[PDB]
Design a binder for this molecule. Structure first.
Ligand code: GAA
Ligand code: GAA
Ligand code: GAA
Ligand code: GAA
Ligand code: GAA
Lengths: 103, 103, 103, 103, 103
């Protein structure tokens, strides 16, 4: 069992860590058909999404997806600092796998 | 996969972006039958709605619809400035498809 | 589609708007069997309830009932000003159908 | 239908109102098997629980129990003043049936 | 029925109370498959996790597992002081069984 985001990220193919250590610059969410997703960006231009739930996701993940979005929304609204993000490299924008926050 | 609300909005017919850059002025929610919805207005400005889950909606959208109303509620409470709204303009008041927030 | 709580309220029988323009004075919720409800009051003594889900309700109203209780709790805890309440006046306390909040 | 926690509490057997008029001193939560409950205490030493969801709860009560825990947690965090608690006295600690917050 | 986290913890094998009396230093959440979990740290380097729901858990725990993660997130954001953590000490990182907050 990983003890941190970096180690966890490393257990998957085409994932990479992005160290941001900054609050989220912008938060966007959509209910539009086939575009029920969330996108976040940081003042430096970095952009990430929380993918539309799909077949690429297993059942156990669906609830975690909803949670990530609750997390991103609140982190944004509170300006919580985002330390790191684990993301899949094979999606544009890069899809969020995990997030770490620290003061 | 779009990287911002504008591009996302451009992916649908009958849509448009409303640039607000202002916090929500009022929030109204109804549990009344066939009128389960949320309605927001902007100071001296427009009124927007999150449509009642109708036949027009695909199953994937339901949760996103619930999420959008929660988002509108908290942005209102917290007085978070809304950047832009992507709405369907073949509906009245215009119906919210997506929302971006940035300071 | 109604653009405000007043117009929405008038779309049903046995309803009426109560203008409060004030914060919720007290918030009460119960988990007791057959009394899973919330009751709020205002400084002026006005008392309102969020009815226990029942046969008078249609399925699409179930989630809305839960959302309204979430709304009242946070509104209460943040002392959000409640503008108006559309209620059904054929129940005691008057049963909330909708709520509007404005600064 | 009752109009306050006191009247609501009286509709059931083995219950009693505790008048606290104080913020919560401690909040405890457990995910341990057969002990998925929550415990709160007030500076005067009073201790109350939200029972593990069980056979003694009708279905309609299930969501309400979860709601009650959310309430206590946010009430704790906001130092919200708890006016009264309606509890079942045939349990130790006494089990929360309802809660009223004011002043 | 236990009246505090310590007595509760003592009801199980392989558990222990960690007394922190401190805010959570970092919060990490993952939606990655088979790694849908949360991990927190304290400035003293202490690491804990909320386990991925697994075979070791009974159904009654799934709900408490989600709420626990909800709890860890709001506490971190509010910088609320965590009093104690009841954990199973036969896992690395130590798995959270319960949490208490006071002061
Ligand atoms: O979202 N889509 O994929 C999609 C595809 C095709 C049409 C379409 O518009 C229709 O449905 C939306 C909600 O989806 C709104 O209610 C519109 O006002 C309605 O006319 C939407
Ligand atoms: O919401 N509707 O579509 C609708 C249609 C017809 C009647 C109606 O009122 C009835 O149900 C509501 C709860 O819905 C309240 O319990 C009222 O006190 C009850 O009289 C509501
Ligand atoms: O809620 N009710 O409708 C209801 C009806 C009859 C008895 C009753 O009490 C029983 O169940 C509650 C939870 O409901 C607590 O566990 C009590 O300690 C137990 O005695 C509750
Ligand atoms: O919670 N219980 O009732 C219970 C009963 C018996 C054993 C037990 O511990 C086992 O499961 C938990 C999750 O429950 C943790 O994963 C422990 O590390 C694992 O060994 C837990
Ligand atoms: O999460 N996993 O356990 C897991 C296992 C194997 C592949 C895998 O990646 C695939 O699915 C994820 C969503 O999970 C993303 O959509 C990736 O971009 C896609 O390639 C993910």
């Amino acid at each position: 069992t990983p003890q941190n985001i970096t180690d966890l990220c490393a257990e998957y193919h085409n994932t990479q860590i992005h160290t941001l250590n900054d609050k989220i610059f912008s938060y966007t969410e959509s209910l539009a058909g086939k575009r029920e997703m969330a996108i976040i960006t940081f003042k430096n231009g970095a952009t990430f999404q929380v993918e539309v739930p799909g077949s690429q996701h297993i059942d156990s993940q669906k609830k975690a997806i909803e949670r990530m979005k609750d997390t991103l929304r609140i982190a944004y609204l509170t300006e919580a600092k985002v330390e790191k993000l684990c993301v899949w490299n094979n999606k544009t924008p890069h899809a969020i796998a995990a997030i770490s926050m620290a003061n």
